[PDB]
C-alpha cells in the first residue's frame with residue numbers, strides 16, 4: 247500500500263542524473279508512466295517520495311514536525327546559517343527564532359521600504375544604464391538591485407557603512423557556494439567549506455563591532471533596523487539571542503531572499519518585455535503610468551494588483567525552489583498510499599505548477615490565470631512552514647518592476663524566453679540567455 251516506485255536500472259546511481267538534467271520532464275514522466283500523482287524515486291539508494299498530486303498537498307504541509315520533519319533534510323544549511331539556527335535548532339527554538347524574523351516584517355515596517363527600494367533601483371540604473379541605449383545581463387543586474395535594495399531596507403546606516411551591499415553579496419556567495427545540492431539526499435572539507443566559515447565569521451566579527459558601537463551610544467536616535475530588532479528580541483525562557491545565533495538569522499533572512507527574489511524579478515521582466523506578451527506589458531503600464539515619481543507603500547500594496555499577478559505567474563511557471571522535503575518520522579497517509587517511516591517525503595512546486603488540471607497549459611505564462619485546484623500553487627510553500635518573506639519579496643519585486651518599466655523600455659535579444667537552468671539548487675533562467683537591450687525614455 248506504498249506508492250509505486252520508478253524503475254532503477256542502476257543501483258549505483260538512482261534517478262540522480264535524469265533528475266539533474268531536467269527534473270520537470272523527468273518528474274512528469276514518472277507521474278505519467280505510473281498513472282499516479284504520488285510516486286517514489288531512488289536517489290543514491292534513498293527512497294524519495296514525491297507528493298505530485300496537488301489535491302494531496304495538505305497531507306504534506308499540514309503534518310506537524312513530530313511526524314514530518316525538515317531538520318534532518320535541511321542539515322546542509324546548518325554550515326551557512328549556524329550550528330544552532332533554524333533547522334539546526336530544536337523546533338521550539340527554531341520556530342521561536344523564525345518568529346522574531348517575521349516580526350521584522352510587521353508591515354509596520356514596510357512604511358519606509360518603497361522609498362528606499364526606489365532609491366537604490368534609481369541609483370543603480372542611473373549608474374549602470376546611463377546611455378540612451380545599451381546591453382546588460384538582466385539576471386546579474388536584478389541580483390545587484392535585490393541585494394542593494396534589501397540592504398537599504400533592513401540594514402541600518404551604520405551597518406551599511408561597515409558592510410555595503412556589494413560586499414555583503416560577496417560573503418553570501420562565498421558561503422552559499424559551499425553548498426552542494428546533492429548532499430540534501432546524500433550525506434566535507436572542500437575549499438568551498440573553508441571560504442564559507444571565514445565569510446560567516448567575517449560577517450560575525452563586523453556585526454560584533456557594530457553592536458559594541460551601538461551599546462556605547464546613548465541614548466536615542468528612529469525606527470530600528472533588522473539587527474536591532476533581533477537584538478531586542480527575547481526567548482520564551484527570557485534570554486537574548488546569542489550573537490552567533492543573531493548573525494545566523496540575518497544570513498538566513500538575506501540568503502533566502504537573494505536568489506528567489508532575483509530570479510522572480512528576472513523571469514517577470516523577461517516575460518513582460520517579450521513581444522508576444524505586449525498584451526500584458528501594456529496592461530502593466532496601464533497600471534503604473536498613473537503613479538507619481540515617489541511611490542508609497544499604499545499604492546504598491548493596494549494599487550498594483552495586476553503586477554502581483556505577473557510576479558505570481560512567474561513563480562508559478564518557473565518556481566525558484568523546485569521542491570521542498572521532510573524526513574518521515576512516522577508513517578503518514580497520502581491519498582490511497584502510505585509513506586513509510588524513513589522516507590524523504592517531498593513536494594514539488596515545479597511539478598504541481600505543471601499539473602494539467604490545476605493549471606491547464608502549464609507552460610503558458612498567463613498572469614490572469616487562477617489555480618483550478620485550490621492549494622495547487624505552492625510557490626511559497628504552505629501550512630506551518632509557509633514562506634515568511636512573501637509579503638516582502640512581492641513588495642520588493644513589484645516596486646522594482648514599477649521603477650524599471652517606468653523609466654526604461656526593454657528588449658529580449660534572444661528569440662524566445664530563456665530556458666530554466668536546473669543545475670543550481672535555487673532555480674532561475676540560464677543567464678547565457680538573459681542578455682537584454684535597454685532604452686531610456688523621453
Ligand SMILES: CC[C@@H]([C@H](C)O)n1ncn(-c2ccc(N3CCN(c4ccc(OC[C@@H]5CC[C@@](Cn6cncn6)(c6ccc(F)cc6F)O5)cc4)CC3)cc2)c1=O
Pocket residue numbers: 262263265266267320323332344427428430498499501502503506567568569570633635668669670671672
Ligand atoms: C546531476 C548531479 C549534479 C549535476 C551537476 O547535474 N546536479 N545537478 C543538479 N543537481 C541538483 C540540483 C538541485 C538539487 N536540489 C536538491 C536540494 N533541493 C533543495 C531545495 C531547497 C532547500 O531549501 C532548504 C530550505 C528551503 C526553504 C529555505 C530557503 N528559503 C525559503 N525562503 C527563502 N529561502 C529556508 C527556509 C527557512 C529559512 F529560515 C531559511 C531557508 F533557507 O531553505 C534545500 C534543498 C533543491 C534541489 C539536487 C541536485 C545535481 O545534484
Ligand code: HEM
Pocket residue numbers: 316344347498499500502503506507510561566567570571624625626627628630631632633634635636638639
Ligand atoms: C520568491 C521568494 C521566496 C520564495 C519563492 C520562498 C519560498 C519559500 C518556500 C517554498 C518555503 C517553504 C520551505 C519548505 O517548505 O521547506 C519558504 C519558507 C520560508 N522562507 Fe521563503 N521564500 C521566499 C522568500 C523568502 C524570503 C524573502 C524570506 C526571508 C525574509 C524567506 C524566508 C523564509 C522563511 C523564514 C521560511 C519558513 C521556513 C520554515 O518555516 O521552516 N522566504 N519560502
